[PDB]
């Protein structure tokens, strides 16, 4: 059941319309939600480059951040509009405040490996991560690049593991987005277990990090609360949250939409 | 005995599928 959900996780998607920015037809992909868009749009370069970092995409106005993921990106910008998610591709004026340059699939590795060491840092001090061969952190990136789940977790699930005496990790990689990308996320340090050793939950880690997602009369939530496209119970356990609806990174990217 | 908060994950992903895939499976895969 549990590893279930880690392959519906891995494979979502969202469909997704590509236009090119005026100054040529559309064209549609299943994008992953859990990768990066300057990783999985080979084929729109190769569509649109027939006609005429450097490429680029714009989401209503506002450059997208290649380096958040995917379904991050779409949950917290778009979620409220029909599918197809209509992004517009753009190859000149790059918007050199707005955007890291992404110059090769190199340059997203090393984001991608950047965003594991520090998550396996909040979780065990690096242990895990430092303690792999080399080749095994190139199997976790080649996971992701080639969409192989078999490949990716046979190694992540080290990642997942953690003190025989212990209940959880030492703290949750999380990092929280409300309305915007330019905004800056919500990140803290934030333990799964209590003082007393209960399991923390989604809605505890709110009340500490982000109570204004928290109507303070009842307790419930105010604010829509998404992670990978779906609305999970304030009672869900975090610990649980961590090992099995965190994206590849390791992080557990969470919107806020009011 | 199931979790209500367990039970809500798997009806959620159920739903999910069918909204992000049942009017979509004519697409290309970005990624093959």
Same mark, same amino acid.
């Given at each position: 059941?549990?590893?279930?959900?880690?392959? !519906?996780?891995?494979?979502?998607?969202?469909?997704?319309?590509?236009?090119?920015?005026? !100054?040529?037809?559309?064209?549609?992909?299943?994008?992953?939600?859990?990768?990066?868009?300057?990783?999985?749009?080979?084929?729109? %370069?190769?569509?649109?480059?027939?006609?005429?970092?450097?490429?680029?995409?714009?989401?209503?106005?506002?450059?997208?951040?290649?380096?958040?993921?995917?379904?991050?990106?779409?949950?917290?910008?778009?979620?409220?509009?029909? @599918? *197809?998610?209509?992004?517009?591709?753009?190859?000149?004026?790059? *918007?050199? %405040?707005?955007?890291?340059?992404?110059?090769?699939? !190199?340059?997203?590795?090393?984001?991608?490996?950047?965003?594991?060491?520090?998550?396996?840092?909040?979780?065990?001090?690096? &242990?895990?991560? #430092?303690?792999?061969?080399?080749?095994?952190?190139?199997?976790?990136?080649?996971?992701?690049? #080639? !969409? +192989?789940?078999? &490949? =990716?977790?046979?190694?992540? +699930?080290?990642?997942?593991?953690?003190?025989?005496?212990?209940?959880?990790? +030492?703290?949750?990689?999380? +990092?929280?987005? &409300?309305?915007?990308?330019?905004?800056?996320?919500?990140? /803290?340090?934030?333990?799964?277990?209590?003082?007393?050793? &209960?399991?923390?939950?989604?809605?505890? @880690?709110? /009340?500490?990090?982000?109570?204004?997602?928290?109507?303070?009369?009842?307790?419930? %939530?105010? #604010?829509?609360?998404?992670?990978?496209?779906?609305?999970?119970?304030?009672?869900?356990?975090?610990?649980?949250?961590?090992?099995?609806?965190?994206?590849?990174?390791? =992080?557990?990217?969470?919107?806020?939409?009011? | 005995?199931?979790?209500?908060?367990?039970?809500?994950?798997?009806?959620?992903?159920?739903?999910?599928?069918?909204?992000?895939?049942?009017?979509?499976?004519?697409?290309?895969?970005?990624?093959?």
């Amino acid at each position: 059941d549990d590893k279930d959900v880690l392959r !519906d996780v891995w494979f979502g998607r969202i469909p997704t319309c590509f236009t090119l920015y005026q !100054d040529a037809e559309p064209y549609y992909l299943l994008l992953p939600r859990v990768s990066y868009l300057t990783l999985v749009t080979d084929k729109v %370069k190769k569509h649109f480059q027939k006609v005429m970092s450097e490429i680029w995409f714009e989401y209503e106005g506002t450059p997208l951040k290649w380096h958040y993921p995917i379904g991050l990106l779409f949950d917290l910008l778009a979620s409220s509009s029909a @599918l *197809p998610w209509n992004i517009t591709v753009h190859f000149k004026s790059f *918007p050199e %405040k707005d955007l890291l340059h992404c110059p090769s699939k !190199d340059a997203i590795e090393a984001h991608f490996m950047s965003c594991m060491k520090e998550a396996d840092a909040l979780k065990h001090k690096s &242990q895990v991560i #430092n303690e792999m061969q080399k080749k095994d952190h190139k199997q976790l990136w080649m996971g992701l690049q #080639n !969409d +192989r789940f078999d &490949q =990716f977790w046979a190694i992540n +699930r080290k990642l997942m593991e953690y003190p025989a005496e212990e209940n959880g990790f +030492r703290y949750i990689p999380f +990092r929280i987005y &409300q309305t915007t990308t330019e905004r800056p996320f919500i990140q /803290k340090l934030f333990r799964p277990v209590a003082a007393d050793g &209960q399991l923390h939950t989604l809605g505890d @880690l709110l /009340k500490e990090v982000c109570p204004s997602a928290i109507d303070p009369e009842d307790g419930e %939530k105010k #604010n829509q609360v998404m992670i990978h496209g779906i609305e999970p119970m304030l009672e869900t356990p975090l610990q649980w949250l961590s090992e099995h609806l965190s994206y590849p990174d390791n =992080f557990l990217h969470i919107s806020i939409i009011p | 005995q199931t979790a209500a908060w367990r039970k809500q994950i798997f009806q959620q992903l159920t739903e999910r599928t069918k909204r992000e895939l049942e009017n979509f499976r004519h697409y290309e895969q970005a990624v093959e």
